[model samples]
Target: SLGSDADSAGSLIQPMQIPGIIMPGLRRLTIRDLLAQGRTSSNALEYVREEVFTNNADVVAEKALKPESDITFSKQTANVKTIAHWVQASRQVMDDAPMLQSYINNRLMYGLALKEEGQLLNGDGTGDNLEGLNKVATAYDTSLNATGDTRADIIAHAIYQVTESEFSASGIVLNPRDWHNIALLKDNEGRYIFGGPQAFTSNIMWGLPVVPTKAQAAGTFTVGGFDMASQVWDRMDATVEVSREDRDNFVKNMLTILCEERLALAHYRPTAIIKGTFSS
Candidate 1:
């Protein structure tokens, strides 16, 4: 019923307008593989419990019986939502106008899909999207002009935050700018801290994988077991729709190419994620 639409199928000889777009040189969706996943009914929501802060004295030696096993906990919920976006191409352009086959198969697919996924994954949850890392809670401040040693130290601080919460650190996400800065750090003897270009490209650090992305803020970083920390609830998978039903598009000989999906994000254990900042 979807892709089976006659307009959605069939090939064209040439595109009406050729795309010469230049894409950014950075990572997108680096946090995608890190987060946990889940599914929900059309209008259902996701709920998670978090431990509330309590000052349970560890050394309170009362002449008391065994302490109770109760620990403070609270529930948090996430809303499942939809995102719809689309592009339109005139019928003349798609109808044997020129090289249209390559346009649809290559350019349109990669361009729109990548852009949408990146933006949604990092969205602030304000515009019907999940709260991405940029807007997550507090971050470990490494102080201004922090030394390279501070980099390693803060990373440990982030890792320890989650590990202490009984969660494992699966990966570290960094803006490409920050990643390159760390990669290009040099010693007093002028040797690269991560060992020049070759070794610097290694994706692993401190035994955890390093995921680079443009979605993150420059000079800030994150460490977490994303897959164990959060999940993306898919309401509807990414779909492409075509129809001449908008604003007399039929008479205008135009067709709308829409790409959209419905989903939500739920952070199971917020503590399983740690944020950090770097020195300028």
Candidate 2:
């Protein structure tokens, strides 16, 4: 009756929702969704540098010849690093593939790959197009050493180090597996440690945006003010090229689709970033 009332002429009505291809599912991309992205020219090199000052204090005693103030100074320094990589996938079909959008999706995949590199490689800038957290000398030097502490305690220790370094803690990055492990932690009472089951999956933790990125390994975690500690510089934005330029592709009637980009990461304040390791 509800269908008949719409229009007397509607002999039998079936809405599109009743019969249509359900939305096709796709891979869930996380790191790219949470990181910062930007674009710049090809020649771009360094971004910014961190300037640190030395501490000078003289404890003085009453009537004692005031200790002749001795000048003291020190500082921490770091540089912006560069990285470049790409992904390519092809088939004889746009000519043969079912989805007309598959080629476009391949390009998207390449872009994600580039962004993931930006997340991990922004550290040292070396090794076969590798530059990232693993390269950060001082950051790794100072550790939250979370192996024996709660997730909350680990984060606090990291924040304390950041503060001691004169930087404010802003964001935290963790692997999904690690975040899940933390979310499941509980006391003797057997209650949800941070929140109920509903809160297990969340974007924010301990007042900071807890970015869960596949870019990180299961036991590695990072806490820092990303905006202050690093920057992403784009040399050449992701671009795609399709051509039968390969040796025999022309005669073979084949094509190649290639996607690539050039970018650099400048991690200035190494101290601003804190690394923590864990087992559970």
Candidate 3:
């Protein structure tokens, strides 16, 4: 009565819930039903010699009409933006270059180094102060020195100096005495200087918010595969995803929706994050 209902092949697709329509011994199932029953052995997907389309159009024409109806578009455009730069280094390898280029550079410098996961403390910049420092040291795989000129130490000092320059440039509590480089700013003006009101300065800043010991490191990046360095600055810049909270929010709101749909129906697919495409 069920499986033998040859007149409607789909009759055997979904297992019937009602007792009479389905004998537990010989269930009438639909694709939806076998899917529900989780059975696939000796299965034929209901049809053969497909005419390849609905009565309205050919399969290729159908695909064109329903382009947005599948996962192809989203997968093809994932985590990408206008092409800028690309780099492939193992994630977790310590970095100084990106930090230095940042406006004030991110919170940490020379302390950058690399290491196996558990070898370091709970990282991601959310650890004890010393442990935090340990991670920095481990990331860069070198200790920091108060007084030195190596590439490591140079970046450390530069971090301090730049931070100070920015902060001291911003803070001024009392009266206006004209002590900063105001002329550099395009709009505002103050003719009076602390000395005589004509030196052309505005306020003071505390400087960059970093120092050897009082700094915070950006957590390690996730390394998903083998290393392959792209040979350009902008290209590399486009490829590496940074650790930004907003980027995470972007993912939660936008990315998961693209994964559920099937893909051979997906001819245009992107495998990685590209510049301008993703942020975080």
Candidate 4:
């Protein structure tokens, strides 16, 4: 037997609930993900790097004195830098919505990553900035360009420039738009050179992995031996903390969520990285 519920509709209310998950913002793979990583306990990374090497082990006679090679080293240092940010939220919101605190903390961490991506490629090394790849990378030799050379040709030459320094190029960094343009290239026969709509593959160029990120400028490119030429020295991994003792936050029923990380970037072989701009 069933009873009519029209008269009891006022009591048939649904309880309110919050979603258990938060959608994360879109992010691109950055150069930091490609480089080597190391741990350090000091505030700065100090080491000696080869400055010059004069090879002299040519043909040597049986009784003749063997030629000696000359090698020189120079001291280098990279200071650890910190990236951090914080947000204020009502204590009640965080208490009532357990996921909100984690969401805010994750967003703060992402903000640090975004800023770090830019600084890794373009920071000018001024004041508190870390010396970035662009500041140490060798400029592309424009003399290698031909009159009708394509963008691919220029990038190939850039890789060659890195090889000329005796380091094998490992990756290419470029803007997503530039990569999209390159991916759409067609031959005179109207066939896609990189891959057609039916073929799917990883992003690659000239036997090197391509990293397409908006952090890189649209008309520029960076080719480097990322695994061997540079390193990231981690002093402290990213951490999140919530506190309510700052100023009048406790009285206002508010708290601050902070996220921070410390690290240093060292370019061991400056010439192993080459930077260039598209001709057109």
Best by TM-score: 4
Task: Name the 10 consecutive residues with the lowest summed lDDT in model 1.
Answer: 137-146
Residue 148, candidate 1: Cα error in Å is 7.4
The reply for model 4, stretches above 4 Å from the true place, is 1-18, 21-24, 53-71
Whose TM-score is higher: candidate 1's or candidate 3's?
Answer: 1
lDDT per residue as tens, model 4, 1-280 = 3344556664576668775675665687468779999899989878897888999879988999999899998998889999888888888888897767767766778888888888889878898888889878889998999987667888888988998879799899998999888888888799988888899857988998899888887898899898999999999999999889977998999998888999899988898998888878
Which one wins by lDDT: 3 or 4? Answer: 4
lDDT of 1 by residue, 186-248 (tens): 768888766766653587778898877776768777887777777778777766667888878
Give the C-alpha lDDT of model 2.
0.60
Tell how far residue 143 is off in model 1, in angstroms.
8.5
Best by lDDT: 4
By TM-score, the better pick of 3 and 4 is: 4
> What lDDT score is found at residue 21 in candidate 4?
71
Q: Give model 3 RMSD, 1 decimal.
A: 32.9
Against the correct fold, how does model 3 do in TM-score?
A: 0.12
Compose the digit string of candidate 2's lDDT tens values, residues 218-279: 78778777676766666666566667766577776766656655556655666777776664
After best superposition, candidate 3 residue 36: deviation in angstroms?
43
Comparing 2 with 4 on TM-score, the higher-scoring candidate is 4
Question: TM per model?
Answer: 0.74, 0.68, 0.12, 0.85
lDDT of each: 0.66, 0.60, 0.22, 0.86
Q: After superposition, how far is residue 197 of candidate 3 from its true place, in Å?
A: 17
Clashing pairs in 4: none
